[model samples]
Target: YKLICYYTSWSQYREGDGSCFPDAIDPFLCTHVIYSFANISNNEIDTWEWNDVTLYDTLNTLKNRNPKLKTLLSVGGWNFGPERFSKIASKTQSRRTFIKSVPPFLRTHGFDGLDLAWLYPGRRDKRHLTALVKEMKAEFAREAQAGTERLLLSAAVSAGKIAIDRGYDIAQISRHLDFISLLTYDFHGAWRQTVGHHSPLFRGNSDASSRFSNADYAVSYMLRLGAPANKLVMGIPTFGRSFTLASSKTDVGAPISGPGIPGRFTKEKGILAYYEICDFLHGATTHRFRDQQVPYATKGNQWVAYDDQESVKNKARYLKNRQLAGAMVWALDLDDFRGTFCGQNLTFPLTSAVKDVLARV
Candidate 1:
């Protein structure tokens, strides 16, 4: 099982509190750590800040602590969107320029390779997307034959069946890539007036929404469509999806007015980090387990659905029994990185639970 974690670029300076940097990452828990994103300008990969270059060097320095560790640079994210990627992938010359530029930039920055995180290519981008991956593969292969280290290529993919089918040619995309990450969270959130779990293991029979929004369904459907099971990793969120209820008696599927109140630390209204979650659940009657193999906490009208130690254990077990690649974390910094907060006498409690279970696999 290959444990992959995403380390974001702006997390080191999160203004509210509990700021995290690459230097603070725990090397033992993950086999690979990918820098969240790099900038793209005129069809070439670039950096957003001058200090980001220094940050890259500092991130690579973590290798001295764990010799088995490897790092990669992720290009494009939700923030970067799909328009620019569509433009780059659609043109042969533009795609080649970016592919050719990748090797030198990675080599200069001491990065292992690249991860294409185009949020979601449009339905029309099926052919364009495959061509981009193919061109990148050819370049990576040529570099390897010339006696340089093998360059890794992977993509962060959508989990929804409609998005998967319309936006990607699965067999082609999966063939040349190392592994594709299933963004298994964000099934439901503040988008609806009703409350629902963001990452349910299996949709309950009573579920009003999200019947096809679980990890099991998405992976099984993709594998049936010829996605390599061994090359798929399940994504786990370090934060919770929060919502405010219309009434105090509300449960899943009950009407909601808006997002939940933020904790003092994260200071985000619609979401809460596990650190803030732990604090919110403190001295509060929480940790209620749903039959769907997920957990939630409610304080009056405030309802937040998130994964804790128990839920993470069940998620890892699901991956083990299903024979998937491994678990992928959305952002390492969101978890109780400080260990000073989330007073469970343990640090990285969410990730540690997953590591312990998947280690046996």
Candidate 2:
């Protein structure tokens, strides 16, 4: 079992109330704390931030407080896109060079593992991905026999059916992957002009296509496709998907003018940090939709869909009942790390909730 928590490297740059630094992260909050992102440079692994090396030291230092905590380095992201991954994966030489760089990079940076945040590998890159994982697994294991704790290998994978079908060789990769971080969130975002919960536990009665959406379907689909329950780390988000309503109606299928207004702290349109959502709920009407097993809030023309403590508890229960490996939080920074914003007086209330439920026998 694992409580894999991802921390975005850029969150440190968020101003004022939105900012989250590495030191503030509670070392005991997660079994594994994956430091998100180091990128590809000259076809070799490299840091994304100018201060990432310093950040690395700061983050890895948390291990001192909790020797049981394992930290990982995640490479590639939606912003990093997929082209570079395709380039590295398409050829053996390119792939080997990339793989050769990983273990050394991880060890030097004090990471106990490497996580491939490859976004969604395309159909053309699917076989290549399998090859990459296979090679990395063998190399990591081989290196361990030479004397070291075996480095863990995992991937932050897509939950969408289309992405899953086109992006992975599930059975083959599952064998090589120590754990599969199933991205069950981001089911919907500002990409479309419609109000929908981005990380609903159950599919809503919205439309026919919606049957393929939601965390339940994603987890089950991966299981059917051969991902072992023990290796499946279902992802949950610490943020909400927001929208600007075109009409007064604020149901699941409500018409949307566009993405919602940006958060004062996060400064991102169409999204709100869980803490930002907390403030939004101050004078907003929040509805807990039983069908989807999540909550949505509306204030004036602003409509937002997100998970709260109750919904997180719901998902945690579902994870336990299903016998999945454990939960993976999309991020730690987005949660109310300061404990002041959400008014729960609990820093990382959502994460702590998952830990409490999963920790139970």
Candidate 3:
């Protein structure tokens, strides 16, 4: 399996503190680590944040410890939007301008390629989306012919069928990407009025909406729609989605007024990192089912749905069975980086089990 891990550029400000720094990365945990994100303005890839310069050097320095490790600079994210991509890919001259700027910016700073994370495109952006990847790959080919290493080109795409149909040309998309990273998690979360699994492998027995809402359904749909399984990398979240139940009866689809209680360390309502969730798991009631591999827990009125080692192992086995290229972690530092949160004293508890399963698979 070609394990790919995303390293957020803004992680320096997170609660992990020094451990989230680029230098603290566990280099062997992934085959490629993507640093997200560099913004685009005035037709150039810009490193607007100051720490990005330092993180760039320190993150790529990971290659020193393990030469096989590859790094990429991810451009655009959920916050970056799709305007720049829409503008540049609409015409050949602008596409050339953006593509020319990428090589110098990435090659000089030690990035192997670029990951286009435009989030999603509207109907108007459908044609330009394919053009962007096609143009980027053309540039990569030119670099390879000139004796420079071929820059890896990849994208982070939505798993929902609506977004897939509206935003992508599957045949064109698969042709250019080294491997497409599917945001397969977040199948359900606090944005809804009812409680649900955040990253279920299979639908909960009571989850009727999960027919196309779960990971298994998404991947299978993509395969039937012509996505190459070997070029598809399933995504896994090292976090859980939490919700506040309006009643004592806690089952799937229980009524909820709003998000769950805020996390102690993360400090975000409706969301908690795996490490933070471990504390809640200390005394909470947990449940699993034969219909699905995911597990959830409840303590009082707070409800949470997430993947532990058991669920992660099942995911790894599914990836192997599907012949996917590998799996991608949203971000590495979100796992118990310090190993202090897990009562069991495990570091990268989720990823550790991921590697364990993929090894034998």
Candidate 4:
């Protein structure tokens, strides 16, 4: 039941003088860290440039600072495809080649393991999907046997049916990895041409349309697919999505009446990060949905949907009831430095509050 924090290159750490490791070490109170987007392509890693002395030195310093810290390098992200992975997992030689490089990288950078986050595995009913995961697992087993320090292997899996059906053989994949982090967020947005709950328990009286929005459905789907509840880590987004309203209409799953766009500061073509949205919330009008247990804000003709303490508490309760593997946030950088997001002027950080609630379970 360890809490893992994921850090990406786009975070403020890369923009500023500070590193996410140090800022997240205490305030967020995370036990493990996952550094994202270490790309693998045609047997050659693309993110090698990020693996310089500065990152290594920073990781080493963090490791020394906190004895309980465990870090892992994550490969692939939202935009990566299956072409390179098809080759990497196609043959035993490629698999072995990929595994061999992981430990040396971990040792070189002072990380403890690896986290695979390949976006897809081609179309549904593809046999290569299961085969790829099996081959990758065998490679992991071989690497673990050969190394002195025990290396952990984990994956950030797709929550949608297409990804679940086409990409992963959950039963076999779960057996090979230490734990699976279920990306439970990003359930709704303007991309769907509707303003819906981003992370809803249920939509109206019916189940959610995608795995992205429904936490309970995700848990049940994984269990049905042979993934144990204890081995699944639920993901929480530290951001929100914005949509343009045509009128004064504001309801979950309401169709967007006008051209939808993200906030200027947090705009990412499709999604908005918490840091950017938080900046927008300063003058926005806020509202809470008791049934869904989530909060949102609307300003002018624009709307932003996000999570607050109440919503987090509801999700944590669900996690506890399912006996899942704690929780993992997408990041810690999005939280207000003073815990304002929690609706409190307290000194404790929002992550700590979330952790404390999960710890109680």
TM-score of each: 0.96, 0.98, 0.95, 0.85
TM-score of 1: 0.96
Off by over 4 Å in 2: none
Q: What is the C-alpha RMSD of each candidate to the true structure, in Å?
A: 1.6, 1.1, 1.7, 3.4
- Ranked by TM-score, the better of candidates 1 and 2 is 2
Ranking by lDDT: 2, 1, 3, 4
Q: What's the lDDT for all of these models?
A: 0.84, 0.89, 0.83, 0.67
Candidate 1 residue lDDT tens string, 1-361:
8889898887776765577778878878788999988978889999876688998988898888889888999999867978989999998898888888998899899988899998888888999989988889889888988687898999999888778888999998889899989988868733678887888888777675557788888888888887888999999888998887787666557888888887676677888988888887865556454667888888767888888888888888998888889999887888887777776776788888889999875
Which 10-residue span in candidate 1 carries the lowest summed lDDT?
282-291
For model 3, state the Cα shift of residue 2 in Å. Answer: 0.6
Tens digit per residue, CA lDDT, model 4, 1-361: 6788776655543333222333444523777877766877667454644444465456446767678788888877865665767777666677667765766677676778788877666664235545645555665567667656677878888676656776678898787678888887756633577776677654435334453357677778898999988789988776675678766777655667544475454335445555455566788898876655677888877787877666776777778788888787786655543344344464334466668788884
Q: What is the alpha-carbon RMSD of candidate 3 to the true structure?
A: 1.7
Per-residue C-alpha lDDT of model 3 across residues 13-104, encoded as one tens digit per residue: 76543247776678887889999889887787889588788889999999999999999989888678586677777877877788889988
**Higher-TM-score candidate of 2 and 3:** 2
Give the residue spans of candidate 4 off by over 4 A: 13-24, 46-53, 91-93, 124-129, 144-147, 206-213, 257-267, 337-348
